[PDB]
Amino acid sequence: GTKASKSGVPVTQTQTAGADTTAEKCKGKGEKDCKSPDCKWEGGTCKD
Structure with a gap:
């Protein structure tokens, strides 16, 4: 909970x-x- 409100490490x-x-x-x-x-085929387009 409340202790830093950001944390030292990400x-x-x-x-x-x-x-x-x-x-x-x-x-x-x-x-x-x-x-x-x-790969995801969406909208007539192959994309990762």
């Missing part, structure tokens, strides 16, 4: 460290190329 929960930030290997792929487990 206490980062998660910031998609595993992902390559943006896997632009997906970007450019057609629907067939775009693997769903790999």
